[PDB]
Design a binder for this molecule. Structure first.
Ligand SMILES: *[C@@H]1O[C@H](CO)[C@@H](O)[C@H](O)[C@H]1NC(C)=O
Lengths: 49, 49
């Protein structure tokens, strides 16, 4: 019943692929909510103009 | 209702609110205040941090 979110930001200079390095992810937030999640989506900010 | 100032007990309005809880079904989030004491140092004591 706990939703855990961990996050990390890292500057990158490589063009496309993931970098060859190591970096841990410190905890960001914990939420005490009980939902039996099975699937998820994503949100896009398209330029409506 | 027939609420009137001249009415005695048993007829005057009374404000009543009932409070209800749950019993160990979801992660608890409404709990009583937690007490605290003064912090001592350099003395053999017991602690509840
Ligand atoms: C998981 O799914 C079942 C399906 O009935 C449901 O009863 C249960 O509450 C769900 N768990 C959580 C944490 O929502």
């Amino acid at each position: 019943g706990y939703f855990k979110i961990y996050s990390k930001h890292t500057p990158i200079n490589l063009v496309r692929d993931l970098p060859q390095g190591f970096s841990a992810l410190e905890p960001l937030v914990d939420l005490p909510i009980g939902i039996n999640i099975t699937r998820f989506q994503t949100l896009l900010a398209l330029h409506r103009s | 209702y027939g609420f009137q100032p001249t009415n005695g007990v048993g007829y005057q309005p009374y404000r009543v609110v009932v409070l209800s809880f749950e019993l160990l079904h979801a992660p608890a989030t409404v709990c009583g205040p937690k007490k605290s004491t003064n912090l001592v140092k350099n003395k053999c004591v017991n602690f509840n941090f």
